């Protein structure tokens, strides 16, 4: 069933014999943070909350320890899909409050909640169904992660068929046992790459599921002897892993985007919503692609989009409109990758789209041709912009973006840039083995 | 002695029993190209020249065979510093001519010659003595180049002392036997790094010597069991290899930089010459640093300069003025690295310097403080610009500079950009092992 | 004490090993044992004072004052092994300067924002290798002496001490913990307060055991010296 009250949560713990409760939250950079609580402490925790070191939220750039209180949310209680011999294990989420009682504005969850509240002012609510892609490599003799492939299958192939097939089935069953209500799961284009699709739901609920999904899959692979990786591009010459985001705005219980009277069956609001996304997508690209490796995926020649355009039939466009209509009307953004922070990513997508609706931003003519096959003069003639080439370029764009700072708040804005800035500086000074293979003999 | 005429060259060949003659020239990208000629063919070659595939000058971007004729220059004849049992070996240089008789404008040597003529129009001549730095690594069991250090010495250290010491001495003796007139040779800051200072001499002769110097040292190291490398940054965490250039302008047989009546003992022309270099240095930075690895060396925290400034006492400044005065007055530019093309690098340095003198560009106030210790606001307040961060940024700067296009000519300009552009695109899509170490387990 | 061998026994039977070294690896944070403490009289916390701006009683100020005055003397007890002082180096969460603060965390003594019955004082110097009986006993005795003598703790340090200069530290009068085990023994060896608290028998025995241990360590040639000096000299 679904637990809504602390009394129901306590009854479930006693009934199913849950021994440990794990909190769940994410830092600014998207890493999943958690700590354990004994089952006996749960009743007191609901009454007064838990004090913890909140400097972990600010990432690995923390300097001074700061204390603030976490208040648990009973509606987010759920039981993890593995049964140790000792007893059951369950997780829970909550809100972060400063000692003075004010909510902490640096929490990525709070950022999304403000965005939801902003949409509520206009009477809109958003549903998101994301498509998550990941790899399944082999472990070495020491159990460390590797990049050894498990099968040479292709798109939608009936692979794997060896014992790795049971591992994949266990992941699907475990997610269903948690009530995620998966739509479909299939092999992807690259070898040993798989994709899992989510049903539509409230954006807040979906974001929590995505965070839970990540460490659930990783835990299962270890106990079966494999490893699940979420790198945007772990291998060269094969397709990368992305997290497309199908999204829709609901007002008064009906889909805003759908419009039977238009030739494209899309409402005027949907045109503005796309226009807002196109205008600002360049600014917050760093949030959707946070790590350096994400830009090894955004290169021409694969399914990854690198040009800013929208289309109804073409797939190379950054924004794609699926042929489904009615309540299923949706907009798919193909830039993000699983390494992104779902809370920050969705919040910016919602805020950027709403701004376009308010300002009646025109999305322009759709691009129904192959942009890659075109020439630079044609792209210049058509005014087709491109996404940032590297992480440093993305930071420079984000940094001066007034809109991004307003949406994310000052505290998150400054902390996010500093962490990324330090990461890029370390990477730019490394001498990669590719240079040695190319320049040692030549020079 | 010095050979002047073809009769003298032929007499020397017969006297010293030279069996093979090797032509010498470089392509646009700086690679050394050569082919062999039997001694008997030499007399015919002097009379009519040698037909050869001239498409090799255009680099590895060549598409179609094209025939140009090389007219040998007797004044460049020299004998290589090794004695095969069969007989002696000699090298020679010459000019490239199109079949219709017009000189080929794509030759890097011709680019420098045009620059000299432009300087000669103002009555000036240039003398350049460079300081070349290189490493000395061990060879594996198969003779392939590797990166194992031969000693852990430091700056000016009396190292190495093992059998590698004899190899180092052999290089010095061989160069002296060539008539190079080496100034001084010493150990450098990084382990197994050495530096050799060339005699302060004419620019045209110096450029040919630098090209000859590179393959002479490499050949000696192989036959002694070691390997000499010219990578701008072969190891991480240690100093890179650079090629500082000291240049001076002479009019009517006297140095024009030296002014006894000024407090700094520098003439007004020298100030303008520095001003021209500072203005245009950003544009042709790609020529001085042509490979991707060059920009790994150009990072803060080492001897490499990354800020556009000039000083008299400071070292981190891009342009340094040595305390020597009088006839030895000189200006040192510290940006280039040994991987650069000496013909193109010197030619642009001359043309940029003259343009400052012609237009009377003020170099501004010198920077006597440590720039690295200053803050970004201070640098913004002081208006201190920085060199391009990576090869892609340098290409973008150099691709719009009309001054570089005018100096290098249309043919060299277009070919150089395309070759670098293709090289960068290949590098930007690689997944380096550093990314795997950082991201495979975290994500 | 029970916790230590319980964890170690479990790890063995599962195939792993649990270590309590104050600094087992170089370049990463060490393991410390912070000690939150509070004093209760008549069933009520004595540190909490609702009438003060910092919600701290006058006794709490004296208790901190006593700890700061004597912390240098019994530092050896809290950090009993040689490895303990590899952890006490600048650049990590370990404190190496004697100060107290409310918001800063690098301070030796940190006061958590919790108030009321949960008011507590955290000392961040000890490490798990210390003897809990001796460490707590000295920690209690030092605090009581401050309360009895009304030692003023001085102004708190709300700035980052590591970022300050030596002249600033000299101007502010900020002391530092002993650098190595030998320095700590010299301080603890002339301290009459430590001798009085621990008793004559424990005092003499503890010093001799540590003294012999340090002497053995100071005469070893570590492989780090060979790497740096064998080729250079
Ligand atoms: Mg897919
Ligand atoms: Mg040098």
With H, G, I as helix, E, B as strand and everything else as coil, classify residue A132: strand
Is B441 an 8 Å CB contact of chain A?
yes
Mode of pairing for the β-strands spanning B32-33 and B18-23: unpaired
Cβ contacts of residue A365 below 8 Å, gap of 6+? none
Q: Are B349 and B407 a contacting pair, CB within 8 Å? A: no
Touching subunits for chain B (3+ Cβ pairs under 8 A)? A, C
**What region does A17 belong to: left with phi over 0, alpha with psi -120 to 50, or beta?**
left
The phi and psi torsions of A63 (rounded to 5 degrees) equal -125, -50
The phi and psi torsions of B243 (rounded to 5 degrees) equal -130, 85
Q: Are A149 and A203 a contacting pair, CB within 8 Å? A: no
Nearest of B150, B243, B246, B247 to residue B190 by alpha carbon: B150
Known binding residue B381? Answer is no
Rounded Cα distance, B356 and B344, in Å: 19
Q: Are C67 and C141 a contacting pair, CB within 8 Å? A: no
DSSP letter, residue B102:
P
- Across the strands, what pairs with A93? A73
Q: What angle, 0 to 180 degrees and rounded to 10, lies between the N-to-C axes of helices B342-359 and B268-280?
A: 120
Rounded Cα distance, B407 and B287, in Å: 12
- Across the strands, what pairs with A22? A36, A91
Rounded Cα distance, A236 and A227, in Å: 19
Q: Are A132 and A195 a contacting pair, CB within 8 Å? A: yes
Rounded Cα distance, A273 and A353, in Å: 5
Is A340 an 8 Å CB contact of chain B?
no
Triad B265, B266, B268: Cα angle to 5°:
140
Count of CB atoms within 10 A of residue A236's CB? 10
Q: Per the CB < 8 Å rule, is B235 touching A431?
A: yes
**Minimal CA separation from C39 to chain A, in Å:** 21
Rounded Cα distance, A41 and B237, in Å: 51
Rounded Cα distance, C25 and C7, in Å: 20
Rounded Cα distance, B271 and B357, in Å: 8
Rounded Cα distance, C38 and A189, in Å: 62
- CA distances to A138, A232, A428, C223 from B434, rounded to whole Å, are 20, 15, 11, 29
The phi and psi torsions of B47 (rounded to 5 degrees) equal -75, -40
Cβ contacts of residue C228 below 8 Å, gap of 6+? none
Chain breaks after residues in chain C, where C lies over 2.5 Å from next N: none
Residues near ion ligand 2 (Cβ under 5 Å):
B 195
The phi and psi torsions of C80 (rounded to 5 degrees) equal -85, -15
The phi and psi torsions of A235 (rounded to 5 degrees) equal -130, 150
Gap from CA of A209 to ligand 1 centroid (Å): 19
Does residue A160 have a cis peptide bond before it, meaning omega lies within 30 degrees of 0?
Answer: yes
Rounded Cα distance, C180 and B300, in Å: 35
Cβ contacts of residue A419 below 8 Å, gap of 6+? A28, A29, A59, A60, A61
Q: Is B53 a catalytic residue?
A: yes
Gap from CA of B133 to ligand 2 centroid (Å): 7
Residues in chain C, total: 233
Per DSSP (E only), the strands in A80-184 are 88-97, 125-138
Rounded Cα distance, A167 and B4, in Å: 81
Nearest of C92, C89, C102, C192 to residue C153 by alpha carbon: C102
Q: Are A233 and A296 a contacting pair, CB within 8 Å? A: yes
Count of CB atoms within 10 A of residue B283's CB? 22
**Percent helix, strand and coil across chain C, each to the nearest 5:** 45, 10, 45
Gap from CA of A376 to ligand 1 centroid (Å): 28
Rounded Cα distance, B334 and B303, in Å: 9
* CA dihedral over A98, A103, A105, A106, signed as positive or negative: positive
Rounded Cα distance, B305 and B387, in Å: 8
**Minimal CA separation from C188 to chain A, in Å:** 31
Question: Which residues from chain B sit within 8 angstroms of residue C227, using beta carbons?
Answer: none
Task: Give the distance from CA A220 to its chain's centroid.
Answer: 20
Rounded Cα distance, A117 and A146, in Å: 43
Q: Are A168 and A226 a contacting pair, CB within 8 Å? A: no
Is B430 an 8 Å CB contact of chain A?
yes
Known binding residue A133? Answer is yes
Cβ contacts of residue A255 below 8 Å, gap of 6+? A248, A249, A326, A327, A329
Cα Rg for chain A, rounded, in angstroms? 23
Rounded Cα distance, B198 and B185, in Å: 9
Rounded Cα distance, B175 and B336, in Å: 22
Rounded Cα distance, A93 and A77, in Å: 7
Nearest of C67, C200, C186, C187 to residue C138 by alpha carbon: C67
Rounded Cα distance, A230 and A241, in Å: 7
Cβ contacts of residue A239 below 8 Å, gap of 6+? A188, A189, A190, A193, A302, A303, A304
* Proximal ligand: closest to the CA of A332: 1
Nearest of B57, C105, B306 to residue A65 by alpha carbon: C105
Rounded Cα distance, C221 and C229, in Å: 11
The phi and psi torsions of C15 (rounded to 5 degrees) equal 95, 5
Nearest of C141, C161, C149 to residue C98 by alpha carbon: C161
DSSP letter, residue C46:
S
The phi and psi torsions of B229 (rounded to 5 degrees) equal -120, 145
How many DSSP H helices and E strands does chain B contain? 13, 17
**Minimal CA separation from A313 to chain C, in Å:** 53
DSSP letter, residue B198:
P
Q: Cα-Cα-Cα-Cα dihedral of C134, C137, C140, C143, to 10°?
A: -60
Triad B387, B311, B287: Cα angle to 5°:
30
Gap from CA of B374 to ligand 2 centroid (Å): 25
Task: Give the distance from CA B183 to its chain's centroid.
Answer: 17
Triad B386, B387, B392: Cα angle to 5°:
130
Mode of pairing for the β-strands spanning A193-197 and A88-97: unpaired
Does residue B160 have a cis peptide bond before it, meaning omega lies within 30 degrees of 0?
Answer: yes
DSSP letter, residue B293:
T
Is A63 an 8 Å CB contact of chain C?
yes
- CA distances to A36, A146, B211 from B214, rounded to whole Å, are 64, 42, 6
- Across the strands, what pairs with B124? B251
Q: Are B111 and B408 a contacting pair, CB within 8 Å? A: yes
Cα Rg for chain C, rounded, in angstroms? 20
Rounded Cα distance, B238 and B236, in Å: 6
Q: Closest chain B residue to A295 measured between Cα atoms?
A: B429
* Proximal ligand: closest to the CA of A337: 1
Is B294 an 8 Å CB contact of chain A?
no
- Across the strands, what pairs with B249? B126
Known binding residue A332? Answer is yes
Q: Are A440 and B231 a contacting pair, CB within 8 Å? A: yes
Rounded Cα distance, B132 and B209, in Å: 12
User: Is B336 exposed, middle or buried (CB count within 10 Å of its CB: 0-12, 13-18, 19+)?
Assistant: buried
Rounded Cα distance, A238 and B46, in Å: 56
Mode of pairing for the β-strands spanning A88-97 and A18-23: parallel
Is B421 an 8 Å CB contact of chain A?
no
> Which of B149, B150, B152 is the best residue to mutate to test the C interface, defined by the most C CB atoms within 10 Å of its own CB?
B152
Exposure letters A289-308 (e unless 16+ CB within 10 A, then b): bbbbbbbbbbeeebebbbbb
Q: Are C177 and C125 a contacting pair, CB within 8 Å? A: yes
Q: Are B185 and B196 a contacting pair, CB within 8 Å? A: yes
How many DSSP H helices and E strands does chain A contain? 13, 16
Chain breaks after residues in chain A, where C lies over 2.5 Å from next N: none
Rounded Cα distance, B390 and A428, in Å: 9
Rounded Cα distance, C184 and C193, in Å: 15
User: Is C209 exposed, middle or buried (CB count within 10 Å of its CB: 0-12, 13-18, 19+)?
Assistant: exposed
- Across the strands, what pairs with B103? B97
- CA distances to B184, B212, B216 from B176, rounded to whole Å, are 11, 13, 12
Experimental method: cryo-EM
How many DSSP H helices and E strands does chain C contain? 10, 6
Is C231 an 8 Å CB contact of chain B?
yes
Q: What angle, 0 to 180 degrees and rounded to 10, lies between the N-to-C axes of helices A164-177 and A203-224?
A: 150
Known binding residue C105? Answer is yes
Rounded Cα distance, B76 and B23, in Å: 10
- CA distances to A103, A307, B168, B347, B401 from B29, rounded to whole Å, are 60, 32, 29, 14, 19
> Which of A392, A431, A437, A441 is the best residue to mutate to test the B interface, defined by the most B CB atoms within 10 Å of its own CB?
A431
Nearest of B243, B199, B31, B202 to residue B113 by alpha carbon: B202
**Å resolution of this model?**
3.0
Count of CB atoms within 10 A of residue A74's CB? 18
Q: Is B382 a catalytic residue?
A: no
Q: Is B15 a catalytic residue?
A: no
With H, G, I as helix, E, B as strand and everything else as coil, classify residue B132: strand
Rounded Cα distance, B38 and B21, in Å: 6
**Percent helix, strand and coil across chain B, each to the nearest 5:** 40, 20, 40
Task: Give the distance from CA C186 to its chain's centroid.
Answer: 17
Sheet of strand B88-97, all strands in order from the earlier edge strand to the far edge: B36-38, B18-23, B88-97, B67-79, B50-53
Mode of pairing for the β-strands spanning B319-320 and B310-311: parallel
Rounded Cα distance, A277 and A362, in Å: 11
């Amino acid at each position: 069933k679904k637990c809504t009250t602390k009394e129901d949560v306590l009854e479930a713990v006693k009934e199913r014999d849950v021994k440990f409760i794990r909190t769940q939250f994410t830092d600014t950079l998207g890493i999943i943070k958690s700590w354990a609580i004994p089952a006996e402490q749960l009743e007191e925790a609901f009454e007064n909350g838990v004090m913890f070191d909140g400097s972990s939220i600010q990432g690995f750039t923390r300097i001074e320890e700061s204390d603030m209180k976490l208040a648990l949310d009973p509606s987010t209680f759920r039981i993890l899909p593995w049964r140790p011999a000792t007893g059951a294990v369950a997780r829970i989420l909550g809100d972060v409050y400063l000692p003075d009682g004010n909510p902490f504005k640096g929490d990525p969850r709070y950022v999304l909640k403000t965005a939801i509240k902003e949409a509520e002012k206009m009477g809109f609510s958003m549903n998101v169904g994301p498509e998550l892609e990941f790899f399944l490599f082999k472990l070495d003799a020491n159990g460390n992660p590797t990049t050894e492939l498990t099968d040479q299958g292709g798109y939608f192939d009936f692979a794997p068929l060896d014992r790795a097939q049971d591992v994949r089935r266990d992941i699907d069953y475990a997610l269903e046992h948690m009530g995620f209500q998966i739509e479909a799961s299939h092999h992807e284009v690259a070898p040993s790459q798989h994709e899992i699709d989510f049903r539509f739901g409230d954006v807040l609920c979906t974001a929590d599921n995505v965070v839970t999904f990540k460490y659930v899959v990783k835990s299962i692979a270890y106990h079966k002897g494999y490893y699940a990786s979420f790198m945007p591009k772990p291998l060269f010459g094969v397709n990368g892993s992305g997290m497309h985001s199908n999204q829709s705005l609901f007002k008064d219980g009906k889909n805003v985007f759908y419009d039977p009277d238009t030739p494209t069956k899309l409402s005027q609001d949907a045109m503005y919503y796309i226009g807002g996304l196109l205008k600002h997508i360049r600014e917050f690209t760093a949030v959707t692609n946070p790590v350096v490796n994400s830009y090894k995926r955004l290169v021409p020649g694969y399914e990854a989009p690198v040009y800013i355009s929208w289309s109804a039939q073409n797939r190379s466009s950054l924004i794609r409109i699926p042929a489904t209509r009615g309540n299923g009307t949706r907009i798919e953004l193909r830039c993000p990758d699983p390494a992104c922070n779902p809370y920050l990513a969705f919040a910016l997508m919602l805020r950027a789209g709403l701004e376009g609706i308010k300002n009646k931003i025109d999305p322009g003519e759709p691009t129904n041709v192959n942009i890659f096959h075109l020439s630079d003069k044609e792209r210049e003639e058509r005014g087709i912009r491109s996404l940032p080439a590297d992480l440093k370029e993305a930071i420079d764009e984000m940094k001066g973006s007034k809109f991004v700072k307003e949406a994310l708040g000052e505290h998150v804005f400054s902390h996010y840039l500093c962490a990324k800035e330090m990461e890029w500086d370390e990477y730019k000074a490394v001498v990669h083995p590719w240079e040695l293979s190319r320049y040692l003999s030549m020079l």
